[PDB]
């Protein structure tokens, strides 16, 4: 099979977050409240005069709410979008998906996503306890998921449903959230927050390459109509993931009690790294077939 796939599979034990930092709970050991939860630097409205007009404790509440929000959306994306695409591959619904190397690589990724959910849930649970947050609004359905659920609405054919689920998961795993890399590299925020994002980024870097490899091999074995449908839904999913939703922002701002939240969000760079998906598209021989305009590779990538 793919030598690259072979490598990623053999490398998993020494790379994986679950193997090498199972004791993440312990990282809250000697917590210090005075370190912030989220970097002000990457807050798009950090210097909006209405944000500066607020109380220092309101600004901190916003920083904290954005961190928690970030975590909630990571868990939702994984559970609703990424894992179901991995689960379909393991279920053998695609020809060539019975290959023992494809199955090994994907099942390893499933173990990782299980651990990612665990780390992010612990992040939320520990932040809430330690910052004394009794009840915040969890509320909004992921926007990416809403868009996916609309695609599937008028789609009776199971084989076509499966292509869509596979594509949405592939995009999700090959387009890296800006906040993942930015939080990973930040030395000003809580050490466990930068740790968790660092561990997650290390696994996700691997998942991106696995997906490029797996999708190429599956596209190769798909019938003509599966192939066309894959190329069809690619730009849709890609546009869904390129989209920025300010709606999350408004809610946090309003929650921390900041006056003129609507003007801040109105008056208002966190672009995903699409490089993995560019690589995926190219490996399909579709570097002329997909109606999507790839954002130029981000500086942190």
């Amino acid at each position: 099979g793919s030598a690259t796939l072979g490598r990623l599979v053999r490398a998993w034990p020494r790379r994986a977050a679950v193997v090498n930092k199972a004791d993440i709970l312990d990282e809250w050991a000697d917590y210090d409240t005075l370190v912030p939860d989220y970097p002000l630097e990457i807050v798009p409205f950090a210097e909006h005069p209405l944000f500066l007009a607020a109380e220092p404790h309101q600004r901190q509440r916003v920083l904290t709410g954005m961190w928690i929000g970030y975590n909630e959306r990571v868990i939702a994306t994984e559970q609703l979008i990424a894992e179901p695409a991995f689960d379909l591959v393991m279920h053998g619904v695609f020809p060539g998906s019975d290959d023992p190397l494809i199955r090994k690589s994907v099942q390893q990724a499933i173990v990782d996503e299980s651990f990612h959910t665990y780390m992010h849930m612990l992040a939320i649970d520990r932040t809430r306890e330690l910052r004394k947050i009794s009840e915040r609004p969890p509320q909004p359905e992921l926007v990416t998921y809403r868009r996916l659920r609309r695609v599937l609405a008028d789609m009776p054919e199971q084989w076509e449903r499966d292509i869509a689920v596979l594509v949405w998961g592939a995009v999700a795993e090959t387009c890296i959230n800006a906040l993942l890399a930015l939080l990973a590299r930040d030395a000003t925020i809580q050490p466990m927050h930068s740790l968790i994002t660092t561990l997650h980024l290390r696994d996700e870097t691997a998942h991106g390459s696995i997906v490029v490899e797996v999708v190429r091999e599956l596209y190769a074995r798909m019938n003509e109509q599966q192939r066309r449908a894959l190329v069809r839904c690619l730009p849709i999913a890609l546009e869904a993931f390129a989209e920025q939703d300010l709606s999350a922002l408004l809610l946090e701002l309003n929650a921390a009690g900041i006056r003129g939240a609507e003007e801040i969000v109105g008056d208002l760079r966190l672009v995903r790294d699409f490089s993995g998906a560019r690589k995926m598209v190219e490996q399909l021989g579709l570097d002329d077939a997909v109606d999507f305009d790839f954002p130029e590779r981000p500086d942190w990538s």
Copy 2:
């Protein structure tokens, strides 16, 4: 909160198979064909004259097929029975399930089961390759899963379906396969086969305790009609897992080409350790209310 739960959560990092034997795939490194896959000592028809009349290679195909059969049923059990009950706990439908300690303990078990699946899949893949087994049906739908789908098909009400899932999952995680314990301690079979089962047994012992605490905690928060539904389906589930099924062994004997297989099967202990579910029943205070005769806990327990 439950002290036991607190315990198992803190111990998970040093206990979990995924942390301590993630490089299980390397374990095929010095493979020796001469060592059997399965212990003749625990094969029920090992001393049957018709099985003794077979050619040596045919006895070996049977031993190997039973090992593969075992692994296939483990994966099916984890994916169709156990995981869906853990997944229901995490998605919040039961009152009290929002508790952070229950969430930590169950998400840890989810990570474990992902890895159990990985280990068993590898076991099959490596066996098929090395024993040069190219064609084989996975064939029969799980008997316990068939029984489950039967019970579910006549439930129009989602809340009732939820109880059955939970309970079926609960019984699966508290009633230990004899094969799991018998293979773990066997010094005569391939060392990876006894390794895989030993690692899975370590994790499964903790899962049974977790499930006892979680179930008790969730039963307490349930409404009256949920209480009743849990109590009613417990003996139904216990019976499925107590049920001996001979159908798979028949296929193995036929696949191997053993003459008089039917008569060997018709002529035909592998009882689970129900001690875990015994403790669960007593933790619910339900000793008088469930109609099930627990077997005397096995020597290996």
